[PDB]
Design a protein around this ligand. Structure first.
Ligand SMILES: [K+]
Ligand SMILES: [K+]
Ligand SMILES: [Mn+2]
Ligand SMILES: [Mn+2]
Length: 134
RNA sequence: ACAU
DNA sequence: CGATGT
């Protein structure tokens, strides 16, 4: 129904899919950029969305913030809930970096706790997520 | 089909 | 038009 304005919104950007992947997190209300990940040479859209949520969890926990996270990715939301990123991306030397990050994000989820609500951004009703790259 |  | 996902 109503946007929860006191929240963090994340989004992925890519050049190709698979391709160069980056992500960022922003204050939903103000658009202030709170974090941005250095581009990763090869990854998928869903790996990036997953990393963005987990980074959001770690960012909010470090700051003792109870804000929710918005993501528009049904896939990544599920992967975080499951603590398992079920990506189809081949493992090779060019994908080693993204896979290490994904593996390490899963490991963090399996060794930490959080109450942070992870919410679906309802693009059909509210327009583009505030962290959108465009 | 839905979400990217 | 292609690809990533549930
Ligand atoms: K995007
Ligand atoms: K499809
Ligand atoms: Mn997105
Ligand atoms: Mn986007």
């Amino acid at each position: 129904e109503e946007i929860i304005w006191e929240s963090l919104s994340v989004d992925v950007g890519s050049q190709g899919n698979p391709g160069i992947v980056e992500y960022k997190g922003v204050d939903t209300k103000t658009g202030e950029v709170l974090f941005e990940r250095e581009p990763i040479p090869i990854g998928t859209n869903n790996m990036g969305e997953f990393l963005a949520i987990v980074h959001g969890l770690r960012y909010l926990k470090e700051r003792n913030s109870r804000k929710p996270i918005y993501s528009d990715s049904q896939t990544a939301i599920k992967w975080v809930k499951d603590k398992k990123a079920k990506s189809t991306l081949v493992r090779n030397e060019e994908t080693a970096l993204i896979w290490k990050l994904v593996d390490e994000a899963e490991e963090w989820l399996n060794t930490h706790t959080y109450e942070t609500p992870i919410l679906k951004w309802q693009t059909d009703k509210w327009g583009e997520i505030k962290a959108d790259y465009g």
